[PDB]
RNA sequence: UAGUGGCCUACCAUGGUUUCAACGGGUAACGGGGAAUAAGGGUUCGAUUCCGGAGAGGGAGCCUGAGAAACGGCUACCACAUC
């Protein structure tokens, strides 16, 4: 919680705690060049 | 644009701090450590392509398929780059040049976990 | 009679005559209307320093055949955006954008040395350090 | 008023300036010897050690005094801005 001694959370709209992109395994399906 | 929490002030934050990485985080009144920030999608990582020059009065070459500890800025990563010629490239098409050139500009090619603010590497 | 009055009372005409024909001269009208002050982004100066905006896109007003490593700059005394130039060309490595120059003309207030629109100002001193002792391989020659 | 004076004021007269350029506008305009000049004339500049004018951030206003509409003097407004 971000505060001052106004509360700001670590809200939902975030990239969850990945390092490489988690949509990247599915992005190993854009078969651009099946050479 | 998405800059909300005000810099300039003092702040008391409950930063969640793992028990794994509790070897070398100390209390600097006499020692030396610092802490940085991140972004949303800096949590994600990407593939980088550096521009490198040779260090001055550093004559002896290094083969360029070898792990060099890259800083682009300050922080350290033993990255395994692919240097290619740093000429004026119209079509932005490069080479898998194996090794180095002793004077001109080199363009590394590697995967790094990315700190996106164009530093002197 | 050679199209002019001569008689020794006619000076009333003559200093009103030339008064209306100085405006057909070019630099007279350029000068006495403050056009160098209402225009000419130096503002009657001899140099100006300003941040480099960015790398420059070549628009052919002929001829120097390359991407001329030129710098979009915008000054800080005025803020009026001008395309610029570096001599001893190449070496596109050694300053970022939003970084300093010192500008000076080509010799005609420029207007033509290469295929780049409005490129009329040689850069003299980037960030306070020179270029002539920086093309001399003491220091290093900037980027955009 | 130190004094001439439309400087005011009270009644009068209907004048005055002008294409011989009135009036109005702009000046990156403080005015006079200087400068670059160099056949001569012309040209452009003059903040600047001297003379004269003006101001003490901008306008007012007053005291003391032979002398100031003074600012390392004062009162007020306006713009700032210290403990």
Coordinates of C-alpha atoms (C1' of nucleotides) in Angstrom, one line a residue:
Chain A
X1 CA 0.0 0.0 0.0
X2 CA 1.5 3.3 -1.1
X3 CA 0.9 5.9 1.7
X4 CA 2.2 9.1 3.2
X5 CA 3.1 9.8 6.8
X6 CA -3.3 8.7 0.9
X7 CA -3.6 5.0 0.3
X8 CA -2.7 3.6 -3.1
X9 CA -2.8 -0.2 -3.5
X10 CA -1.0 -2.5 -5.9
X11 CA -4.2 -2.7 -7.9
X12 CA -5.5 -5.5 -10.2
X13 CA -4.7 -3.9 -13.6
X14 CA -1.0 -5.0 -13.5
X15 CA 1.4 -7.6 -14.9
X16 CA 1.4 -10.3 -12.3
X17 CA 4.5 -11.2 -10.3
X18 CA 6.1 -12.6 -16.1
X19 CA 9.8 -12.0 -16.9
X20 CA 9.5 -13.3 -20.4
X21 CA 6.0 -12.5 -21.7
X22 CA 3.4 -15.1 -20.6
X23 CA 1.6 -14.7 -23.9
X24 CA 4.8 -15.7 -25.6
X25 CA 4.3 -19.4 -25.6
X26 CA 1.1 -18.8 -27.5
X27 CA 3.1 -16.3 -29.6
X28 CA 5.1 -19.4 -30.7
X29 CA 2.3 -20.1 -33.1
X30 CA 2.6 -17.2 -35.6
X31 CA 4.1 -19.5 -38.2
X32 CA 5.5 -16.6 -40.3
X33 CA 8.1 -18.6 -42.2
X34 CA 7.7 -22.4 -42.2
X35 CA 10.9 -22.6 -44.3
Chain B
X1 CA 1.3 10.4 -18.6
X2 CA 0.6 7.7 -15.9
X3 CA 2.7 9.4 -13.2
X4 CA 0.6 9.7 -10.1
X5 CA 2.6 9.3 -6.8
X6 CA 4.4 12.5 -6.2
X7 CA 8.2 12.7 -6.3
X8 CA 9.9 15.3 -4.2
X9 CA 8.3 14.2 -0.9
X10 CA 9.0 11.6 1.7
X11 CA 7.2 8.3 1.6
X12 CA 6.5 5.3 3.9
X13 CA 5.7 2.2 1.7
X14 CA 5.2 -1.4 2.7
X15 CA 7.4 -3.0 0.1
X16 CA 6.9 -6.8 0.1
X17 CA 10.4 -8.2 0.8
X18 CA 11.2 -11.8 0.2
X19 CA 13.0 -14.0 2.7
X20 CA 15.0 -15.7 -0.1
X21 CA 17.1 -12.6 -1.0
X22 CA 18.3 -11.7 2.5
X23 CA 22.0 -12.1 2.3
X24 CA 23.3 -8.6 1.3
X25 CA 20.6 -6.0 2.0
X26 CA 22.1 -3.8 4.7
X27 CA 21.6 -0.6 6.7
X28 CA 23.8 2.1 5.1
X29 CA 25.1 4.7 7.6
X30 CA 28.6 3.4 6.8
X31 CA 28.2 1.0 3.8
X32 CA 27.0 1.4 0.2
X33 CA 23.7 0.2 -1.2
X34 CA 20.8 1.8 -3.2
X35 CA 17.3 0.8 -4.5
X36 CA 15.6 1.5 -7.8
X37 CA 12.1 1.5 -9.4
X38 CA 10.3 -0.4 -12.2
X39 CA 7.5 0.0 -14.6
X40 CA 4.4 -2.0 -15.7
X41 CA 5.9 -3.7 -18.8
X42 CA 9.5 -3.5 -17.6
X43 CA 8.4 -6.6 -15.7
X44 CA 8.3 -8.2 -19.1
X45 CA 11.6 -8.5 -21.0
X46 CA 12.7 -8.4 -24.6
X47 CA 15.5 -8.8 -27.1
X48 CA 18.1 -6.0 -27.5
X49 CA 20.6 -4.9 -30.1
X50 CA 23.4 -2.7 -28.8
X51 CA 25.8 -0.2 -30.4
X52 CA 29.4 -0.7 -29.1
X53 CA 32.6 1.1 -29.7
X54 CA 36.0 -0.1 -28.5
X55 CA 37.3 1.3 -25.3
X56 CA 40.0 3.9 -25.8
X57 CA 43.7 2.9 -25.3
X58 CA 42.4 -0.7 -25.0
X59 CA 44.0 -2.2 -28.1
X60 CA 43.6 -5.9 -27.7
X61 CA 40.5 -7.5 -29.3
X62 CA 37.9 -10.0 -27.9
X63 CA 36.0 -12.6 -30.0
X64 CA 32.4 -11.6 -30.2
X65 CA 30.5 -14.9 -29.6
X66 CA 31.5 -14.9 -26.0
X67 CA 29.8 -13.9 -22.7
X68 CA 30.6 -10.3 -21.9
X69 CA 29.1 -8.7 -18.8
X70 CA 26.9 -6.1 -20.4
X71 CA 25.9 -2.9 -18.5
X72 CA 23.7 -0.5 -20.5
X73 CA 23.8 2.0 -17.7
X74 CA 25.1 0.5 -14.4
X75 CA 23.5 -2.9 -13.7
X76 CA 25.3 -6.1 -14.7
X77 CA 24.3 -9.1 -16.8
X78 CA 26.7 -11.6 -18.3
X79 CA 25.0 -11.5 -21.7
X80 CA 26.0 -13.5 -24.8
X81 CA 25.9 -11.0 -27.6
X82 CA 26.4 -11.1 -31.4
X83 CA 28.4 -8.2 -32.6
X84 CA 27.7 -6.9 -36.1
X85 CA 29.1 -3.9 -38.0
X86 CA 27.9 -0.5 -36.9
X87 CA 27.7 1.2 -40.3
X88 CA 25.0 3.4 -41.6
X89 CA 22.4 0.7 -42.5
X90 CA 19.6 1.8 -44.9
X91 CA 17.6 -1.4 -44.9
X92 CA 18.3 -2.3 -41.2
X93 CA 19.5 -5.7 -42.2
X94 CA 22.5 -7.1 -40.3
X95 CA 25.0 -9.9 -40.1
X96 CA 25.8 -12.8 -37.9
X97 CA 29.4 -11.5 -37.7
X98 CA 31.2 -13.9 -35.4
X99 CA 34.0 -11.8 -34.1
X100 CA 35.1 -8.2 -33.6
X101 CA 36.7 -5.3 -35.6
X102 CA 39.5 -3.4 -33.8
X103 CA 38.3 0.2 -34.6
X104 CA 34.8 0.7 -35.8
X105 CA 31.3 0.5 -34.3
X106 CA 29.8 -2.9 -33.3
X107 CA 26.1 -3.8 -32.9
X108 CA 25.4 -6.5 -30.4
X109 CA 22.4 -8.8 -30.7
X110 CA 21.2 -10.7 -27.6
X111 CA 18.3 -11.5 -25.2
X112 CA 18.4 -9.5 -22.0
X113 CA 16.1 -9.4 -18.9
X114 CA 14.9 -4.6 -20.7
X115 CA 15.8 -1.3 -19.0
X116 CA 14.5 1.0 -21.8
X117 CA 16.3 4.4 -21.4
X118 CA 19.3 4.5 -24.0
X119 CA 22.3 4.6 -21.7
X120 CA 26.0 4.7 -22.5
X121 CA 26.6 1.0 -22.4
Chain C
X1 CA 16.6 67.4 -69.8
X2 CA 17.4 63.9 -68.6
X3 CA 14.0 63.3 -66.9
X4 CA 14.9 65.3 -63.7
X5 CA 14.5 68.8 -62.4
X6 CA 17.7 70.7 -61.9
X7 CA 16.9 74.3 -61.0
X8 CA 18.3 75.6 -57.7
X9 CA 15.0 75.5 -55.8
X10 CA 14.0 72.0 -56.7
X11 CA 15.7 70.1 -53.9
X12 CA 12.2 69.8 -52.3
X13 CA 11.5 67.3 -55.1
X14 CA 14.8 65.5 -55.1
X15 CA 15.2 64.4 -51.5
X16 CA 11.5 63.4 -51.8
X17 CA 12.3 61.7 -55.1
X18 CA 15.2 59.4 -53.9
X19 CA 13.1 58.9 -50.7
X20 CA 10.6 57.0 -52.8
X21 CA 13.2 55.1 -54.8
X22 CA 15.3 53.7 -51.9
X23 CA 12.4 51.3 -51.4
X24 CA 13.2 49.7 -54.8
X25 CA 16.6 48.8 -53.3
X26 CA 16.5 45.5 -51.6
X27 CA 18.4 45.6 -48.3
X28 CA 17.0 49.1 -47.6
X29 CA 13.4 47.7 -47.3
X30 CA 14.8 44.6 -45.6
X31 CA 16.6 46.8 -43.0
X32 CA 14.2 49.7 -42.2
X33 CA 11.2 47.6 -41.5
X34 CA 12.8 45.4 -38.8
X35 CA 12.3 42.3 -41.0
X36 CA 15.5 40.9 -39.5
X37 CA 13.7 41.3 -36.1
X38 CA 10.3 40.0 -37.1
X39 CA 11.9 37.0 -38.8
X40 CA 15.3 35.3 -39.4
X41 CA 15.3 32.9 -36.3
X42 CA 18.7 34.2 -35.1
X43 CA 16.9 37.5 -34.6
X44 CA 19.8 39.5 -36.0
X45 CA 22.3 37.5 -33.9
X46 CA 25.5 35.8 -35.0
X47 CA 25.1 32.5 -33.2
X48 CA 22.5 30.5 -31.2
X49 CA 22.6 27.5 -29.1
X50 CA 19.8 25.1 -28.7
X51 CA 18.8 21.5 -28.1
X52 CA 19.0 18.9 -30.9
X53 CA 15.4 17.7 -31.6
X54 CA 16.3 14.5 -33.4
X55 CA 17.9 12.8 -36.4
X56 CA 16.8 14.5 -39.7
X57 CA 14.8 13.3 -42.6
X58 CA 16.4 14.3 -46.0
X59 CA 14.2 16.3 -48.4
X60 CA 16.0 16.9 -51.6
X61 CA 17.0 20.4 -52.3
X62 CA 20.1 19.3 -54.1
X63 CA 22.7 17.4 -54.0
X64 CA 24.9 15.8 -51.2
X65 CA 23.9 12.2 -51.7
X66 CA 23.5 10.5 -48.3
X67 CA 21.5 10.8 -45.1
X68 CA 23.6 13.7 -44.1
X69 CA 23.8 13.0 -40.3
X70 CA 22.0 16.3 -39.8
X71 CA 20.2 17.4 -36.7
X72 CA 16.7 18.8 -36.2
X73 CA 17.3 21.5 -33.6
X74 CA 15.1 23.9 -31.7
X75 CA 16.7 26.9 -30.0
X76 CA 16.2 28.2 -26.5
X77 CA 16.5 31.9 -27.0
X78 CA 13.5 31.7 -29.3
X79 CA 12.3 28.1 -29.8
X80 CA 12.1 28.2 -33.6
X81 CA 12.8 24.9 -35.2
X82 CA 15.6 24.8 -37.8
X83 CA 17.4 22.0 -39.6
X84 CA 21.2 22.0 -38.9
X85 CA 24.4 20.5 -40.0
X86 CA 27.8 19.1 -38.9
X87 CA 31.0 19.3 -41.0
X88 CA 33.7 16.5 -40.9
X89 CA 30.7 14.4 -41.3
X90 CA 29.9 10.9 -40.0
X91 CA 30.7 9.7 -36.4
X92 CA 27.0 9.4 -35.5
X93 CA 27.6 8.2 -32.0
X94 CA 28.4 10.7 -29.3
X95 CA 25.6 12.8 -28.0
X96 CA 21.9 12.1 -27.3
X97 CA 18.9 14.2 -28.4
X98 CA 17.9 17.3 -26.5
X99 CA 21.5 18.2 -26.3
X100 CA 23.4 21.4 -27.0
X101 CA 25.1 22.9 -30.1
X102 CA 26.4 26.3 -31.2
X103 CA 25.1 27.4 -34.6
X104 CA 26.7 29.6 -37.3
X105 CA 26.0 30.0 -41.0
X106 CA 27.6 28.5 -44.1
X107 CA 28.7 31.7 -45.9
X108 CA 25.5 33.0 -47.5
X109 CA 23.4 32.6 -44.4
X110 CA 23.7 29.1 -45.8
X111 CA 20.6 28.1 -47.9
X112 CA 22.6 25.5 -49.9
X113 CA 25.3 23.1 -49.3
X114 CA 23.5 19.7 -49.5
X115 CA 20.1 18.0 -50.3
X116 CA 18.5 19.0 -47.1
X117 CA 15.7 21.6 -46.6
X118 CA 16.7 24.7 -44.8
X119 CA 20.1 23.5 -43.8
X120 CA 22.1 26.7 -43.5
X121 CA 23.8 26.5 -40.1
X122 CA 27.1 24.8 -39.2
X123 CA 27.3 23.5 -35.6
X124 CA 30.4 25.0 -33.9
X125 CA 30.5 23.8 -30.2
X126 CA 28.4 20.9 -28.9
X127 CA 27.7 21.2 -25.1
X128 CA 30.3 23.9 -24.7
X129 CA 33.2 21.8 -25.9
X130 CA 34.4 22.5 -29.5
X131 CA 34.4 20.4 -32.7
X132 CA 37.8 21.3 -34.1
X133 CA 39.6 19.9 -31.1
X134 CA 37.0 17.2 -31.1
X135 CA 37.5 16.1 -34.7
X136 CA 41.2 16.3 -33.7
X137 CA 40.7 13.0 -31.8
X138 CA 41.0 14.6 -28.4
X139 CA 37.3 14.2 -27.7
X140 CA 34.6 12.6 -29.7
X141 CA 32.1 13.7 -32.4
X142 CA 28.4 13.7 -31.6
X143 CA 25.2 12.0 -32.7
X144 CA 21.8 13.7 -33.0
Chain D
rU1 C1' 4.8 83.0 -9.8
rA2 C1' 11.0 84.7 -8.1
rG3 C1' 8.8 86.8 -12.6
rU4 C1' 6.7 87.5 -18.7
rG5 C1' 2.6 84.7 -20.3
rG6 C1' -4.1 81.5 -21.5
rC7 C1' -0.1 79.8 -16.8
rC8 C1' -5.0 79.9 -15.0
rU9 C1' -9.9 82.4 -14.1
rA10 C1' -14.4 86.0 -15.8
rC11 C1' -16.6 88.0 -20.0
rC12 C1' -15.5 88.9 -25.3
rA13 C1' -13.9 88.1 -30.5
rU14 C1' -13.8 83.4 -34.4
rG15 C1' -9.5 82.3 -34.8
rG16 C1' -4.9 79.3 -35.7
rU17 C1' -1.9 75.2 -38.9
rU18 C1' -1.5 73.0 -43.6
rU19 C1' 0.0 69.6 -50.2
rC20 C1' 6.0 75.1 -48.8
rA21 C1' 3.1 69.1 -45.9
rA22 C1' -0.5 70.3 -40.9
rC23 C1' -2.4 66.6 -38.0
rG24 C1' -1.9 61.1 -37.2
rG25 C1' 1.6 56.5 -37.1
rG26 C1' 6.3 53.8 -36.4
rU27 C1' 11.3 54.1 -34.3
rA28 C1' 15.5 47.6 -32.3
rA29 C1' 15.3 57.1 -31.2
rC30 C1' 18.8 60.3 -25.3
rG31 C1' 20.6 64.4 -28.2
rG32 C1' 26.0 67.0 -29.7
rG33 C1' 32.6 66.0 -31.2
rG34 C1' 33.7 59.9 -32.8
rA35 C1' 33.7 55.4 -36.1
rA36 C1' 34.3 52.6 -40.7
rU37 C1' 35.5 55.2 -44.6
rA38 C1' 39.7 57.2 -47.7
rA39 C1' 40.0 60.6 -55.7
rG40 C1' 35.9 63.7 -54.2
rG41 C1' 31.1 63.8 -52.8
rG42 C1' 27.8 60.0 -50.3
rU43 C1' 26.9 55.9 -46.8
rU44 C1' 25.9 53.7 -41.8
rC45 C1' 26.6 53.9 -36.5
rG46 C1' 27.1 57.2 -31.8
rA47 C1' 25.0 53.0 -24.4
rU48 C1' 29.9 54.3 -23.8
rU49 C1' 36.0 58.4 -20.1
rC50 C1' 33.6 65.2 -22.2
rC51 C1' 28.9 68.7 -22.5
rG52 C1' 23.7 69.0 -22.0
rG53 C1' 18.9 66.1 -20.8
rA54 C1' 16.4 62.4 -18.0
rG55 C1' 15.6 58.5 -13.8
rA56 C1' 16.7 55.8 -9.1
rG57 C1' 11.0 49.7 -9.9
rG58 C1' 6.4 52.8 -12.1
rG59 C1' 3.2 57.3 -11.3
rA60 C1' 2.0 60.9 -7.7
rG61 C1' 3.2 64.4 -3.3
rC62 C1' 5.5 67.2 0.3
rC63 C1' 9.1 68.8 4.2
rU64 C1' 14.1 71.1 5.5
rG65 C1' 16.7 74.4 2.7
rA66 C1' 19.8 79.8 -1.2
rG67 C1' 19.1 75.5 -3.9
rA68 C1' 15.4 69.0 -4.6
rA69 C1' 9.1 67.4 -6.8
rA70 C1' 15.9 64.6 -4.1
rC71 C1' 15.1 58.8 -3.4
rG72 C1' 22.7 55.6 0.4
rG73 C1' 15.5 62.2 2.2
rC74 C1' 10.3 61.5 3.7
rU75 C1' 4.3 60.2 3.1
rA76 C1' 0.8 57.5 0.1
rC77 C1' -0.7 54.2 -4.0
rC78 C1' 1.0 50.3 -7.5
rA79 C1' 4.6 45.7 -8.4
rC80 C1' 7.6 43.0 -5.4
rA81 C1' 9.6 41.0 -1.0
rU82 C1' 12.9 39.8 3.9
rC83 C1' 12.6 38.2 9.9

